[PDB]
Amino acid sequence: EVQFGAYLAVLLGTFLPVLFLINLYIQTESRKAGRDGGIDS
Amino acid sequence: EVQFGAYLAVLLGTFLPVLFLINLYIQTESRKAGRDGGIDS
Amino acid sequence: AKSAATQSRARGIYGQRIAALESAVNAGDFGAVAAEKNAFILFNSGAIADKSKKSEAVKQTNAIFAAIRAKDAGALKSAYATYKGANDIKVIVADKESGQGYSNDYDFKARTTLGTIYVR
Amino acid sequence: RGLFDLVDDWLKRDRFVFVGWSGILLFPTAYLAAGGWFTGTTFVTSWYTHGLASSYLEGCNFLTAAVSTPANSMGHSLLLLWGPEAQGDFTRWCQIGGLWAFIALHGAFGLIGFCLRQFEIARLVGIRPYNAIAFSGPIAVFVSVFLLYPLGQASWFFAPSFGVAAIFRFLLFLQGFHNWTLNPFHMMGVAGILGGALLCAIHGATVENTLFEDGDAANTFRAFTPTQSEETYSMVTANRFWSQIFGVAFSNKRWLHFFMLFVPVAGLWTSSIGIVGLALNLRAYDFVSQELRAAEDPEFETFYTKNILLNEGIRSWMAAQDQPHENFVFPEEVLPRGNAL
Amino acid sequence: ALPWYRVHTVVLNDPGRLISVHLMHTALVAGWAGSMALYELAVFDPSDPVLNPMWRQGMFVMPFMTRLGITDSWGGWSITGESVSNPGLWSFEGVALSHIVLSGMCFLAAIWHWVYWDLELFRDPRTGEPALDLPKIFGIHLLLSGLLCFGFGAFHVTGLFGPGIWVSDAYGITGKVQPVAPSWGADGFNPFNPGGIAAHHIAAGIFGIFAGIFHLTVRPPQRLYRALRMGNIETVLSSSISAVFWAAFVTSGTMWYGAAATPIELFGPTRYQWDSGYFQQEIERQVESSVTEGLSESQAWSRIPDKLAFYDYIGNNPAKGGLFRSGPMDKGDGIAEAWLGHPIFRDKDGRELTVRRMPAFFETFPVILVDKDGIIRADIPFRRAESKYSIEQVGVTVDFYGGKLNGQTFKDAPTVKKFARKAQLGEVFEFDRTSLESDGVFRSSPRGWYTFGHANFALLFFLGHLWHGGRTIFRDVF
Amino acid sequence: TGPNPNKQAVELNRTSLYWGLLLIFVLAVLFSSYFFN
Amino acid sequence: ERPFSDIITSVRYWIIHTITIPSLFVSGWLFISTGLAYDVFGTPRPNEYFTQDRQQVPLVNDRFSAKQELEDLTKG
Amino acid sequence: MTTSLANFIASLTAGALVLSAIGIALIIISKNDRV
Amino acid sequence: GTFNFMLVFQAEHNILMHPFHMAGVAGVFGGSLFSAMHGSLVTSSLIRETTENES
Amino acid sequence: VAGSLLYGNNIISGAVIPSSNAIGMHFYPIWEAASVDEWLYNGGPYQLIVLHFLL
Amino acid sequence: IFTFRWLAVHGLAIPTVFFLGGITAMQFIQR
Amino acid sequence: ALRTRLGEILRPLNAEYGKVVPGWGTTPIMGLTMVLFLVFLLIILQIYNSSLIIENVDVDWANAI
Amino acid sequence: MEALVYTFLLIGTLMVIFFAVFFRDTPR
Ligand code: CLA
Ligand SMILES: CC1=C(/C=C/C(C)=C/C=C/C(C)=C/C=C/C=C(C)/C=C/C=C(C)/C=C/C2=C(C)CCCC2(C)C)C(C)(C)CCC1
Ligand SMILES: CC1=C(/C=C/C(C)=C/C=C/C(C)=C/C=C/C=C(C)/C=C/C=C(C)/C=C/C2=C(C)CCCC2(C)C)C(C)(C)CCC1
């Protein structure tokens, strides 16, 4: 009925950039927390 | 011939944990850089 | 594990043993007839996969042995005949043209009259 | 004080061998299991259950004697000496195969007692109980195979027998009927075992070849005080050597030993899962796509199809005598065979 | 500072966030149940409940729903075969929507109980540090468990206020949901007696109520308090893990061997029924009873129901599948359509021959025909050079009684050989092999996957007992 | 409500990252053939 | 105390062992020679594997009637 | 009250006897060599 | 291919009854056992220098 | 016998097939074949790989 | 007399000698 | 620490952290109960295993009702 | 078409090994 490669295209193209953005945000927050001397470094 | 769901299973189950581990390492490095005063915050 | 092979083995061995008693019971060998109590019990226990049939066989065997303990040559013969008719017991001898009773050892027909082997 | 305190003080003294509270479970069960195996491989036969001779009294040697599994007609009976199968009468109990159940049931509690003893001694000397997990590995292997495999099958008859050649029969049987070498869990078990052997050999050689010169004789064994503070060997030289030969090397001394502990236990635990799977006939036997292509194209051939044919041969030529209670009769014209031989 | 395998230990001494994380696991579980039910309902075919039951389409959570009373759907059909007019709220879809809404509400409650973490209830009055009096919390939650146990058995299973449970006959031909009266005698411990469920849950509930009342009002002995480290939270985890894997082993055993709580019409037949010959002997007994009544062979074999004969086919054996063959059982053979009848093989002299059946433990079996005593009379040779028992040489014929091929006979060798090949797997049926594009290899029923999963989980959780409990005992060294 | 005193930080050095990547890739390599069937 | 290196030298140990051990060794030899083991454990003798009537392997074929079956297979 | 029940209770009694014998040995030896 | 090699080799030469193969099996099993024992013994005897929140 | 991925093999079933039985123990370098196709038909790469690897 | 060591060593050395005598007797049985 | 209505309602149920009874006590009852539970488990296991046969109990698929 | 998946996985493993060997944390 439909094209099979579309499953892979949609799922990979949704999952990869989302994780890239979450990575960027989390590393920013970790750097900010590390800069201020606190209980979590 | 082969099962189609195996494509999705293999690709997703390989890609997601890799990005998870990379995120862990990168946030650790960012916190370490933030703790030590320098040009990169 | 109970299965059809167990019934086949028990039926073979104990039915042959019971059918061997025809000539003995025709005239009367009360001691020799009572000498196969274990065979009768084993056939009743491990060769019939049916509750009602097992109960009937136990009743018939009890009647046979009760007639045995009476010096009764007629009731014993009648009960033996009805047991044979009910349980379908007969002496069986095979040939080689349509044969192959056994192939290897461990079989209950290795050296019996049921055992025929065709070697190419 | 009370009786409990006196018994506790007596049990944890410093005598010939430690007893402890776990000794009550450990000693009788292990002693009985070992004695049962010794008395079964010497006097008891297997004529009435398997149709074999399995004792020294009959003529077997160390490589062929065994304690065989009970008869198939007794499916999963506990086979107690006082049970409804033997009803006392030690001789019938031996003849039907009660010694196998005796040995297995006592040996399981022996293993449990040994693990508890490890816990107790570790607590007494005040150290972490890392030996208990390492032993839990083999406990998993024993439990898994020797108990879970028969319980999912027809009867106890399909369990390994306590003998040298019986284990070989078990190996060949599982290869022939289950294609156990293709399972991705025996693969991880093999990897773990071989990696453990590799680690043992390499660590021994590396430590022995980086010793510090602390003596004057070529006999380097007598240059070690029973215990001192200084390290015996050089870690820097070992790191340099293995990083310039292999490309990567250890640098932390605790990670090395944790890795050594971790590898084989992981291998055993992974293989136990595959055995538990086989217990339910959930095999990894076939590759469906290759079977379909070979069915429709009579020129496709790989090593996998060759192994399949070998398995078929094993089954056909072994089943007749391997399961005597099924009365299998196979005429010569039906047995699969190749050309010539 | 924490390594990746110690991250979730931040709530060890925080009673407010432990509730939150446990609520999160609860919400995830409820959401999975609801979504799985919804997905299953969209691929289920309720047209034929005779030759296409639920256990042949790969349904996993539907049997558990229908075991306790759920039998109707909003689409107008019922699981037993019926036309319902007004199903009501508690149908196959209402349950899924209920578990879903519960998941959402638990999510919101978890968020709240996480944000507001500092509550006076979790603080010790005299020292001001967080604390939890575990020996009394155990009593409270145990009394709750006992009360719940008593009501399920006294009201839901017995009928006083509820529908009851699924009860079938000995051969799985007519099953339905009906209330069950408790049996208090020695036969209440019979696993296959459904009357033991009510008695067990009632008595266990009463004893749980009494045990809760006790463990509520009596403080622990000092020696036991010191020995078992009752002031530590991890000992509870170790004990709970032990109990959980014990329960998993018990449930796996009862599912594999069979009991009254795993009916045949819901999960499928067992392997021991194929081993012993349950349905075959029942069919033979029924046919003999019909014949003795004064009927012909054709009529006697035509009175056999198709559902009874379907259980006597090796494709329904749970011990016949594979680990990596995925999908429903319909993916292997196709969808069963009709029964073909019972074939009877006769040789040149009229005596009856029987094809030796394939054991569940083999994958390829030779074709052999034996007589009433076990002596071979014909077979299909592997080497056609000096064979003596070929079907062509012996001249075997086959007749069919009952089913679709009633009254027909065959005499040529090729058709006889084809039917002999078909007859070593049990009864013969007609399948639809194109709707799902079936491949041709057997698969496993829901009775096997459950056993595999929960048995492996129990084996893994034993190691959890060991590790977590050892960490409890050796706290001061760790 | 307020600042929680139980907050800590996670850590993963490069050696552990390499070990994890190798484990994931090897597991995928091993199980892909069986998943495809 | 008194570790093994002292026991392996004391003469009383030697005399008690020289009087005790051969009794046990001879007891084992007589246990085998007299044919008692075949009776205790049920191992068939080299001329009892097949009887004059039974020429096949005697496999037990029942669970709850094993006593009668074994009695019949043995001699009867 | 069949033979199985009688043998089951007898086995329970035998196990109790074995445990009692072991416990008696431990108590006697512990009290003797107090310290 | 290794599985094919092993099966044919066992069929033709009856390995598993050669004492040298038994020696090899004992070698690998004992190596794994000794590795596990050494790792456990050395790791258990570590001196306390970290407290809780550090590997 | 097929042994490569491109000819319908997976990782488990793929292999490099040994040389032909007709060759025996004879040395079979590339330059001793009439063409590269003949070299590949008779299992040429096996000898090359094993020899260079043992060295 | 009743020490743990004596009971051990003995309870694993008496059956060993008994069984060794039994095997030595077995070595001369003729078919 | 915030105080809520439910907190005040449930406060008494969590107020006795650490309270114990000095020296043994109800331990023999616990031991006796554990022994009885073991006997019960053995009985039901042997009934299910067919190693213990009692009258009017048949371990097989039941016709039920 | 699965040969692409197999090749990708193998080459990825080789890349991981290369990076582990040549871009490694200094032991000091
Ligand atoms: C009001 C609450 C409620 C109700 C009525 C239901 C109702 C239902 N659920 Mg649901 N569920 C709920 C809440 C609820 N759920 C919540 C909160 C969760 C998340 C945790 C779930 C998660 C869930 C899943 C994952 C599944 C269901 C399923 C089901 C259905 C079958 C239930 C079944 O077989 O249970 C059987 C329950 C048991 C066998 C539990 C046994 C209890 C153990 C043995 C306790 C023993 C320990 C105890 C302490 C002993 C000591 C006490 C003693 C001394 C007295 C049924 C429609 C199933 C279904 O059909 O799928 C849609 C299913 O798969 N539910
Ligand atoms: C079962 C049973 C029981 C028990 C018993 C027992 C306990 C026994 C014991 C026994 C024993 C305890 C025995 C032992 C024996 C031993 C032996 C027999 C040994 C031998 C050895 C040798 C021969 C050596 C060899 C060698 C080596 C190893 C190496 C080097 C070389 C040489 C050659 C020197 C009872 C009573 C409870 C009853 C019930 C049943
Ligand atoms: C919010 C809210 C809401 C909503 C809700 C929802 C929408 C939900 C959903 C939910 C869901 C929808 C959920 C889901 C879940 C799922 C899960 C949780 C899953 C899991 C899985 C897993 C875990 C698996 C795993 C695995 C694999 C993957 C493979 C094989 C093995 C195993 C099985 C292990 C409402 C409106 C109502 C209300 C308001 C609020």
Nearest Cα residue to L52 out of L62, L40, L64: L40
Question: Which of these, A10, C3, D331, lies nearest to E274 by C-alpha position?
Answer: C3
* φ, ψ of residue E405 in degrees (nearest 5): -95, 35
L51 part of contact set with chain D, CB < 8 Å: yes
Is the Cβ pair J12, F33 closer than 8 Å? Answer: yes
CB pairs under 8 A between D and I: 86
- Is-contact D144 I46, C-beta < 8 A? no
Would you call D235 helix, strand, or coil by DSSP? helix
Contact status, residue J20 vs residue J43, Cβ threshold 8 Å:
yes
Is residue D284 less than 8 Å (CB to CB) from chain M? no
At I27 the three-state DSSP class reads helix
Residues 6+ apart with CB under 8 A from D89: G67
Question: Residue-wise over E114-126: b if at least 16 C-beta within 10 A, else e?
Answer: beebebebbbbee
Residue of D nearest to C2 (CA): D73
CA distances from E265 to D11, E73, E427, E431 (A): 57, 19, 19, 20
Q: C40 with C18: CB under 8 angstroms?
A: yes
Pairing mode, if any, of strands E335-339 and E342-346? unpaired
Give the C-alpha separation, L55 to L43, whole Å. 15
Q: Chain J partners of F36 at a C-beta cutoff of 8 Å?
A: 10
Structure tokens at L13: 């149920």
- Both tokens of B11, joined, read 């690709």
| J10–F36 CB contact, under 8 Å | yes
Find the helix or strand (DSSP H, E) in which D66 lies: strand D66-67
Single out the residue of D1, J39, H8 nearest to residue E223, CA to CA: D1
Chain D neighbors of L53, CB-CB under 8 A: 84
Q: Which residues contact D123 (CB under 8 A, 6 or more apart)?
A: D129, E473, E474
* Ligand 3 atom 21: residue of nearest CA: E32
Rounded to a whole number of angstroms, the distance from the CA of M23 to the nearest CA of chain F is 10
D261: number of Cβ within 10 Å: 26
Chain J residues with beta carbon closer than 8 angstroms to that of D293: 8
Asked whether the beta carbons of residue D182 and residue I3 sit closer than 8 angstroms, the reply is yes
Structure tokens at D95: 């003849």
Tell me if E460 CB under 6 Å of ligand 3: no
Ligand 3 centroid distance, CA of E43 (Å)? 19
Element (H, E) at B11: helix B5-35
Which residues 1-28 of chain M have a CB within 8 Å of chain F? 2, 5-6, 9-10, 12-13, 16-17, 19-20, 24-25
Chain G residues 22-51 within an 8 A CB cutoff of chain K: 24-29, 31-33, 37, 46
- Nearest Cα of chain D lies from the Cα of H27 at a distance, in angstroms, of 7
Chain H residue closest to L50 (CA)? H4
Which has the closest alpha carbon to D158: D186, D177, D182, D142?
Answer: D177
What distances in angstroms separate CA E384 from CA B34, C102, D331, E205, one per listed residue?
83, 21, 13, 70
The residue to mutate among E35, E39, E323, E461, having the most atoms of ligand 3 within 8 angstroms of its beta carbon, is E35
Bridge partners (DSSP) listed for residue D283: E322
- In whole angstroms, what is the distance from residue J44 CA to residue J28 CA? 7
DSSP letter string, J1-17: ---SGGGT--TTT---P
CA distances from J3 to J11, J17, J45, M5 (A): 10, 7, 13, 17
CA angle L24, L26, L28 (to 5 degrees): 90
Q: Is E189 annotated as a binding residue?
A: yes
Please tell me the distance in Å from M26's CA to the nearest CA on chain F.
10
Q: Is D292 on the interface with B (CB under 8 A)?
A: yes
CA–CA dist L14, L7 (Å, integer) = 10
* Gyration radius of chain G over CA positions: 23
* Closest by Cα among E221, K23, C57 to L28: E221
Strands D162-163 and D66-67: antiparallel
Task: Decide if D33 contacts D99 (C-beta within 8 A).
Answer: no
What is the DSSP-derived secondary structure letter of residue D162?
E
Determine whether the interchain pair K22/D19 forms a contact, defined as Cβ–Cβ distance below 8 Å: no
CB D143 within 8 Å of CB D105: no
The one-letter code for the residue type at L48 is: Y
**CA–CA gap between residue C96 and residue E225 (Å, rounded):** 81
CB < 8 Å to F7, chain E: 10
HEC states along chain E? CECCCCHHHCCCCCHHHHHHHHHHHHHHHHHHHHHHHHHHHCCCCCCCCCCCCHHHCCCCCHHHHHHCCCCECCCCEECCCCECCCCCCCCHHHHHHHHHHHHHHHHHHHHHHHHCCCEHHHECCCCCCECCCHHHHHHHHHHHHHHHHHHHHHHHCCCCCCCCEEECCCCCCCCEEECCCCCCCHHHHCCCCCCHHHHHHHHHHHHHHHHHHHHHHCCCEHHHHHHCCCCCCHHHHHHHHHHHHHHHHHHHHHHHHCCCCCCHHHHCCCHHHHHHCHHHHHHHHHHHHHHHCCCCHHHHHHCCCHHHHHCCEHHHCHHHCECCCCCCCHHHHCEEEEECCEEEEECCCCCEEEECCCCCCCCCCCCEEECCCCCEEEECCCCCCCCCCEHHHHCCEEEEECCCCCCCEECCHHHHHHHHHHHCCECCEEEECCCCCCCCCCCCCHHHHHHHHHHHHHHHHHHHHHHHHHHHHCCCCC
Q: Across the interface, do H4 and L51 touch by the CB < 8 Å criterion?
A: yes
Beta carbons within 10 angstroms of residue D88's beta carbon: 12
Q: Cβ contacts (< 8 Å) between B24 and chain E: which residues? A: 4
Q: Are E57 and E42 contacting, i.e. CB atoms less than 8 angstroms apart?
A: no
Give distance in angstroms: CA of E213 to centre of ligand 1: 24
Q: DSSP label at D234?
A: -
CB E387 within 8 A of CB E381: yes
Running DSSP on this structure, what letter comes out for residue D46? B
Residue K6 gets which letter from DSSP?
H
CB contact under 8 A, B22 and F24: no
Tell me the residue type at F33. Answer: S
Name the residue of chain F whose CA is nearest to M18's CA.
Answer: F18
User: Which residues are CB-contacts of M3 (< 8 A; sequence separation ≥ 6)?
Assistant: J5, J6
Burial of E406 (0-12, 13-18, 19+ CB in 10 A): middle
Residues in contact with ligand 2 (CB, 6 Å cut-off):
D 32, 35-36, 38-39; K 12, 15-16, 19-20
E261 phi and psi angles, rounded to 5 deg: -90, -5
- Single-letter residue type at F28: A
Element (H, E) at C117: none
- The CB density around residue D286, as the number of other CB atoms within 10 Å, is 18
Please give the C-alpha separations between residue E407 and each of E303, E304, E399, E402, E410, in angstroms, as whole numbers: 14, 15, 7, 8, 10
Gap between the Cα atoms of J16 and J34, Å rounded: 22
**Has E465 been labeled as part of a binding site?**
yes
D303 Cβ contact list (under 8 Å, min separation 6): I1, I3, I4, J1, J3, J13, J15
Place of tokens 């006939």: D281
Q: How far is the CA of D35 from the centre of ligand 2 (A)?
A: 6
Ligand nearest to the CA of E93: 1
Strand partners, E322: D283
- Name the one residue in this structure whose structure tokens are 């519960």: E102
Q: Which of E107, E326, E460 for mutating ligand 3's site (highest number of atoms within 8 Å of CB)?
A: E107
Instruction: Name, in order, each residue with C-beta under 8 angstroms of C59's C-beta and a sequence gap of 6 or more.
Output: none
- Name which of M20, M21, M27 is nearest D239 (Cβ-Cβ): M27
Q: Residue D95: which of G42, G61, G62 has the nearest Cβ?
A: G42
C-alpha to C-alpha distance for C11 and C92, rounded to whole angstroms: 12
HSE of E124, CA atoms in CB hemisphere, 13 A: 15
Chain F residues closer than 8 Å to B33 by CB: none
Are E337 and E306 within 8 A, CB to CB?
A: no
Each residue of C90-103: b (16+ CB within 10 Å) or e? eebebeeebbbbbb
J 16-35 → M contacts, CB under 8 A:
none
In the block, residue with structure tokens 């003798």: G45
CB contact G48 to C (< 8 Å): no
The 3-state DSSP class for residue C66 equals: helix
Q: Nearest Cα to E142, choosing from E197, E216, E198? A: E216
- Ligand 1 neighbours, Cβ below 6 Å, are E 26, 29-30, 33, 37, 61, 64-65, 68, 95, 99, 102, 145-146, 149, 204-205, 208, 247
Burial class (CB in 10 A: 0-12, 13-18, 19+), D98: buried
Nearest CA to D129 among E478, E9, E463?
A: E478
Q: CB-based contacts of D1: which residues, under 8 Å, 6+ apart?
A: none
Nearest Cα to E366, choosing from B19, G26, I53, D319?
A: D319
- A5-39 exposure pattern, b = at least 16 Cβ within 10 A, e = fewer: eeeeeeeeeeeeeebeeebeeebeebbebbbeeee
DSSP state of L2: B
Element (H, E) at D163: strand D162-163
* Count, residues in chain E: 478
Can you read off the two tokens belonging to residue E80?
Answer: 């037993």
Contact by Cβ (8 Å): D284, D275: no
CA of E378: how far to CAs of C7, C116, E72, E362, E396, in Å? 22, 14, 52, 21, 8
Residue E382 near residue D331, CB atoms below 8 Å: no
Cα E427 to Cα E401: distance, rounded to the nearest angstrom: 12
State how far the Cα of E275 lies from the Cα of E262, in Å rounded to an integer.
19
Interface contact J10, partner M, CB < 8 A? yes
Please give the Cα distance from J10 to J3 (Å, whole number).
9
Q: Please name the residues in contact with E127: beta carbons below 8 A apart, sequence gap of 6 or more.
A: none
Which of E39, E64, E100 is the best mutation target for the ligand 1 pocket, counting ligand atoms within 8 Å of the beta carbon and taking the most?
A: E64
Instruction: Render the burial of E158-191: b for 16+ CB within 10 Å, e for the rest.
Output: beeebbbbbbbeebbeebebeebebbeeebbbbb
Alpha carbon distance D76, E185 (integer Å)? 27
Give the residue among E377, G62, E357, D329 at the shortest CA–CA distance from C14: G62
SS3 L41: helix
Residues in chain K: 31
What is the rounded distance in angstroms from the CA atom of residue I40 to the CA atom of residue I42?
A: 6
Q: How far apart are CA F23 and CA E4, in angstroms?
A: 15
Place of tokens 């680990």: E323
Q: What DSSP state is assigned to residue D67?
A: E
**What's the gap in Å between E64 CA and the centre of ligand 1?**
10
E120–L1: do the CB atoms touch at under 8 Å?
yes
Please report which helix (H) or strand (E) contains residue C88, including its range: none
